[PDB]
Amino acid sequence: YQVVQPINGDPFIGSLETPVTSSPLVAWYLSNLPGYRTAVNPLLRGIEVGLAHGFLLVGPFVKAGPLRNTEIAGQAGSLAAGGLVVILSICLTIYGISSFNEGDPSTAPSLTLTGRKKQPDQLQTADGWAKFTGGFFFGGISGVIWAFFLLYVLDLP
Template structure:
């Protein structure tokens, strides 16, 4: 058995001898690697369909989509795992905590927009970053303000669904 393994090390046709990690764009000076994970078609498709990289969206639309998703999922841990989880006001506490965190995150986005962030660079996963997405302080501020609106909206939707779960289940089940 050991001889077969040793013999396969010398065969270029053996799949175990193929390289799978390369420098990005075959340029080692970039300091990035092209791996089977970040260069796979599935990874590229998924990343390029996220609102931050989807072409043709305005910064406000990007912020609204990202904010809605974050507001919606941030509500759950605060409502169901927070210190008031066993009280009648657990959902309200989760809503207020989620809104508070969205406001803090919006403040962080505003601070970042004022720091003159660099332009998006092409990478293995996103070879063509959107040109109009985050290219100025104004676009970052539009993203942040829409993130606030979307985040509060997402938290309110999650609160409404969680608080009225019995009614919703009665309608469909």
């Protein structure tokens, strides 16, 4: 018995299968994430994305920036995370602008892991990428807002 096998029995594709890339727990997990929910509206997935990442990007700008000890300005450093959200969503927008055109199908793969046809993932559109952009951005700014809302003392403010 051996644990590593070529990807789907094809030993001439440039990859392998491991307990890291093809494992039931990892497969199910990575499947149930927004980026891998193919049959779902781009905007909902983007919403999840922006929520989680604004909330996460709150902490570091607060606890490490130049005014970390000045607290007449320490907590309101969420301005910075809002600005970072704005900047990388501008970047999302220009990436989608350059990578796609509406009058062209979505470049995603049409086959699945076993050899059945799928309806190409629409996130790789121009339309749906702009939709996902709006979703991520909405979520990012309001997630910044949410994690700034919880200023109540917990364990480490």
